[PDB]
């Protein structure tokens, strides 16, 4: 979806920030210059899409170049946004994370023990034509001390995988009742 865009130059980093606009960068196989945009609207847009869905930045050069984000480098101290990277899209093989949707409340759950998941996004290679909005995956009946991983998840056809996939996707573990104070003994 749409955000503005602004061609960056040889202007000092700090100032662009403490004026009104966060700075950025874009690169695709050969195309590399420097860019930047507003803060507040950018933050709004980001909070939705970010490295989940697709961005479309219409730039003061005449066009409407659509990218994805990629990497959110911050200041860490009083941590908060400060220069991101953008990825100029196409139709070529590309790995990226897909936010997953654990749907349905299992048996390990409701018995007490709660899901201690591993991921909320999986690395997967796809053609940029496939948009796997979010794999609204099962988690029908996970048990306490029970796990699930691998290719267990449904994958939207074409949208391949990119781990092992023995990467354990999630699992349910015990609570932490006041009987853990008896442990203090």
């Amino acid at each position: 979806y749409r955000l503005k865009a602004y061609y960056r130059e040889g202007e000092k980093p700090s100032a662009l920030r403490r004026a009104g606009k966060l700075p950025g960068v874009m690169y695709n196989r050969h195309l590399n210059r420097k860019v930047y945009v507003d803060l507040v609207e950018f933050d709004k847009v980001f909070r939705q899409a970010s490295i989940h869905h697709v961005i479309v930045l219409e730039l003061p050069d005449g066009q409407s170049l659509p990218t994805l984000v990629r990497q959110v480098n911050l200041d860490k101290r009083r941590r908060r946004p400060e220069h991101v990277d953008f990825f100029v899209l196409s139709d070529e093989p590309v790995e990226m994370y897909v936010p997953l949707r654990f749907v349905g409340t299992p048996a390990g759950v409701r018995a007490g023990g709660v899901l201690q998941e591993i991921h909320r996004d999986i690395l997967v290679k796809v053609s940029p034509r496939n948009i796997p909005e979010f794999i609204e995956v099962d988690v029908s009946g996970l048990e306490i001390g029970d796990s699930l991983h691998a290719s267990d998840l449904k994958l939207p056809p074409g949208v391949e995988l990119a781990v092992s996939p023995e990467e354990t996707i999630a699992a349910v573990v015990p609570p932490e009742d006041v009987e853990k104070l008896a442990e203090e003994a």
Binding site: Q71, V72, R79, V114, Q116, P175, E176, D177, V178
Partner: protein, 141 residues
Amino acid sequence: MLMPRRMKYRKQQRGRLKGATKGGDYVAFGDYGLVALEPAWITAQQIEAARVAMVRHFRRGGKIFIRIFPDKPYTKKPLEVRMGKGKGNVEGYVAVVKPGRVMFEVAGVTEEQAMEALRIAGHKLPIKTKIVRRDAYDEAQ
């Protein structure tokens, strides 16, 4: 309450603490997170007291993860014994905490629950804190 298990040298130098935090500044784990603002030590005593404080507030809770680890000696000497002579004794095990550092995460609760949990627990911490959700940082191994 955490420490290593007898390792290398016993006594080591406390040193001054800057503020790059080196790393550890997002959620990734739980869902709600307590992160700090004052460059100090986290005390194993406190550490346990806060972990409890949370657990205590919400009987039969979820899973409370502890990112930081208290693994530094308290070089403390006896009392009224005059100076020089020896270093001290390793005592009170603590850790370096530089602001903008995740220390504990609550997962699987009410909004209110993790709010007041992190609230009270960190309220018991040797300093003061900020309590954040889980979003703007996504993508970091």
